Amino acid sequence: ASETETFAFQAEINQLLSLIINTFYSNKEIFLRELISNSSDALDKIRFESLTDKSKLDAQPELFIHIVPDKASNTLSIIDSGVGMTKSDLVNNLGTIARSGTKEFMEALAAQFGVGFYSAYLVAERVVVTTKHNDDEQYVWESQAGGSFTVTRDTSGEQLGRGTKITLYLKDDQLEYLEERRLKDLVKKHSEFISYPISLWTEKT
Ligand SMILES: Nc1ncnc2c1ncn2[C@@H]1O[C@H](COP(=O)(O)OP(=O)(O)CP(=O)(O)O)[C@@H](O)[C@H]1O
Secondary structure (H helix, E strand, O other): OOEEEEEEHOOOOOHHHHHHOOOOOOOHHHHHHHHHHHHHHHHHHHHHHHHHOOOOOOOOOOOOOEEEOOOOOOOEEEEEOOOOOOOOOHHHOHHHHHHHHHHHHHHHOOOOOOOHHHHHHHOOEEEEEEEOOOOOOOOEEEEEEOOOOEEEEOOOOOOOEEEEEEEEEEEEOOOOHHHHHHHHHHHHOOOOOOOEEEEEEEEEE
């Protein structure tokens, strides 16, 4: 049926990506704290609307963050019970939105506070976001950071019912972040100190 609406990137978002990706960072580990942030924020926002209305939390009436390395697909996934996004929050907040502090965060850096979501693309060549808000259906956002992304209505297969799953497809050199030592440490590490619980799940072979 083609629920995919293919869009193109902000001109400045492109710059923002070019900064991140095309600068070798010793520690690209920044990205994880960056994602767990936006997740805490999402759990925080749903926890809020959950006072004014209790029909909200009913979806998954528990607030969690899951981290799944999967060596099959070489992906690292981040999963919360948080607010989620509508097609609008997808097409509007992810791709078309310059996060708070301007790219002059980094633009003046030619001459971390925080990078946010886009920090993901230093360890991954590709990323897919599967999300469920309450007022809207489940949508799927995907980009290779090649100056266009795609948003697709996903009414089929499995639903979270609420919240968001970010799955990043790691670059061939970046697979260290599929490791349990690497990650168990990083759980307990920067942004372990936080409101919600963090489960790391790994496959025993
Ligand atoms: N886990 C999540 N659940 C739902 N929406 C999310 C999300 N992570 C990001 N978003 C949406 O995408 C937007 C833009 O992403 P981005 O990470 O660039 O900014 P941010 O609002 O997370 C602050 P920062 O720049 O510090 O991360 C967010 O404002 C939010 O609307």
